[PDB]
Design a protein around this motif. Structure first.
Motif, PDB file in Angstrom:
ATOM      1  N   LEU A   9       4.811  -1.515   0.858  1.00 41.08           N
ATOM      2  CA  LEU A   9       3.737  -2.469   0.470  1.00 41.08           C
ATOM      3  C   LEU A   9       4.299  -3.508  -0.501  1.00 41.08           C
ATOM      4  O   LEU A   9       5.223  -3.235  -1.241  1.00 41.08           O
ATOM      5  CB  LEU A   9       2.596  -1.705  -0.201  1.00 41.08           C
ATOM      6  N   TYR A  12       0.386  -7.847  -3.718  1.00 41.99           N
ATOM      7  CA  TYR A  12      -0.862  -8.661  -3.777  1.00 41.99           C
ATOM      8  C   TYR A  12      -1.934  -8.054  -2.866  1.00 41.99           C
ATOM      9  O   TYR A  12      -2.904  -8.699  -2.523  1.00 41.99           O
ATOM     10  CB  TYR A  12      -0.558 -10.086  -3.320  1.00 41.99           C
ATOM     11  N   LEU A  13      -1.772  -6.820  -2.471  1.00 42.82           N
ATOM     12  CA  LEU A  13      -2.790  -6.185  -1.586  1.00 42.82           C
ATOM     13  C   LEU A  13      -3.744  -5.336  -2.428  1.00 42.82           C
ATOM     14  O   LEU A  13      -3.493  -5.066  -3.586  1.00 42.82           O
ATOM     15  CB  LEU A  13      -2.092  -5.295  -0.557  1.00 42.82           C
ATOM     16  N   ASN A  14      -4.837  -4.911  -1.855  1.00 38.43           N
ATOM     17  CA  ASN A  14      -5.806  -4.079  -2.620  1.00 38.43           C
ATOM     18  C   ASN A  14      -6.187  -2.843  -1.794  1.00 38.43           C
ATOM     19  O   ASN A  14      -5.419  -1.908  -1.679  1.00 38.43           O
ATOM     20  CB  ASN A  14      -7.052  -4.912  -2.934  1.00 38.43           C
ATOM     21  N   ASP A  15      -7.360  -2.823  -1.218  1.00 38.02           N
ATOM     22  CA  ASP A  15      -7.770  -1.641  -0.408  1.00 38.02           C
ATOM     23  C   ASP A  15      -8.106  -2.094   1.011  1.00 38.02           C
ATOM     24  O   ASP A  15      -7.758  -1.449   1.981  1.00 38.02           O
ATOM     25  CB  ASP A  15      -9.004  -0.999  -1.040  1.00 38.02           C
ATOM     26  N   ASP A  16      -8.782  -3.199   1.139  1.00 39.74           N
ATOM     27  CA  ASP A  16      -9.145  -3.700   2.494  1.00 39.74           C
ATOM     28  C   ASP A  16      -7.946  -4.417   3.113  1.00 39.74           C
ATOM     29  O   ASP A  16      -7.871  -4.598   4.311  1.00 39.74           O
ATOM     30  CB  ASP A  16     -10.323  -4.672   2.382  1.00 39.74           C
ATOM     31  N   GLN A  17      -7.002  -4.820   2.308  1.00 40.97           N
ATOM     32  CA  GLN A  17      -5.806  -5.513   2.861  1.00 40.97           C
ATOM     33  C   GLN A  17      -4.798  -4.465   3.319  1.00 40.97           C
ATOM     34  O   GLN A  17      -4.332  -4.483   4.440  1.00 40.97           O
ATOM     35  CB  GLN A  17      -5.177  -6.398   1.783  1.00 40.97           C
ATOM     36  N   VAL A  18      -4.472  -3.541   2.463  1.00 40.22           N
ATOM     37  CA  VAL A  18      -3.506  -2.480   2.850  1.00 40.22           C
ATOM     38  C   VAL A  18      -4.152  -1.598   3.920  1.00 40.22           C
ATOM     39  O   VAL A  18      -3.483  -0.894   4.648  1.00 40.22           O
ATOM     40  CB  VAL A  18      -3.160  -1.630   1.626  1.00 40.22           C
ATOM     41  N   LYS A  19      -5.454  -1.643   4.022  1.00 41.16           N
ATOM     42  CA  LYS A  19      -6.151  -0.820   5.047  1.00 41.16           C
ATOM     43  C   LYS A  19      -6.145  -1.568   6.379  1.00 41.16           C
ATOM     44  O   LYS A  19      -5.753  -1.037   7.399  1.00 41.16           O
ATOM     45  CB  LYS A  19      -7.596  -0.571   4.608  1.00 41.16           C
ATOM     46  N   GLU A  20      -6.572  -2.803   6.378  1.00 45.33           N
ATOM     47  CA  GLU A  20      -6.586  -3.587   7.646  1.00 45.33           C
ATOM     48  C   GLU A  20      -5.186  -3.578   8.265  1.00 45.33           C
ATOM     49  O   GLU A  20      -5.014  -3.847   9.437  1.00 45.33           O
ATOM     50  CB  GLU A  20      -7.004  -5.029   7.349  1.00 45.33           C
ATOM     51  N   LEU A  21      -4.186  -3.261   7.489  1.00 46.35           N
ATOM     52  CA  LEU A  21      -2.801  -3.225   8.034  1.00 46.35           C
ATOM     53  C   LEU A  21      -2.611  -1.921   8.805  1.00 46.35           C
ATOM     54  O   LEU A  21      -2.139  -1.911   9.925  1.00 46.35           O
ATOM     55  CB  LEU A  21      -1.796  -3.292   6.881  1.00 46.35           C
ATOM     56  N   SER A  24      -4.852  -1.556  12.268  1.00 38.32           N
ATOM     57  CA  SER A  24      -4.655  -2.358  13.508  1.00 38.32           C
ATOM     58  C   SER A  24      -4.533  -1.409  14.701  1.00 38.32           C
ATOM     59  O   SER A  24      -4.794  -1.775  15.829  1.00 38.32           O
ATOM     60  CB  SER A  24      -3.377  -3.187  13.383  1.00 38.32           C
TER      61      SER A  24
END
Length: 85
Positions: A9, A12-21, A24
């Motif tokens: 990682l 600059y990610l949080n929870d919905d960003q590292v999650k949407e990754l 997929s």
């Protein structure tokens, strides 16, 4: 069928960003993140889990082995702690 680990990682990610990754490939039955964010450090990795098992082996085929600039994406199956072979 286990908890996948993402040691690649950015920051600059949080929870919905590292999650949407890791989402997929599909929906995750579990999700978590690992970063100091308390004293000024940054582990740089998180954890997650899918509802299906094959899905997990799929995220590794589309993630494990994805260098970036100065670090390598350590995306693999985070479930060892075993002494059986």
């Amino acid at each position: 069928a286990h908890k996948l680990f993402i040691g690649g990682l950015p920051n600059y990610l949080n929870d919905d960003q590292v999650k949407e990754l890791l989402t997929s490939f599909g929906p995750l039955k579990a999700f978590n993140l690992v970063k100091d964010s308390a004293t000024g450090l940054s582990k740089g990795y998180a954890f997650c889990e899918y509802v299906d098992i094959n899905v997990t082996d799929q995220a590794i085929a589309g993630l494990n082995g994805m260098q970036l600039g100065d670090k390598k994406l350590l995306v693999q199956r985070a479930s060892v702690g075993a002494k059986n072979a």
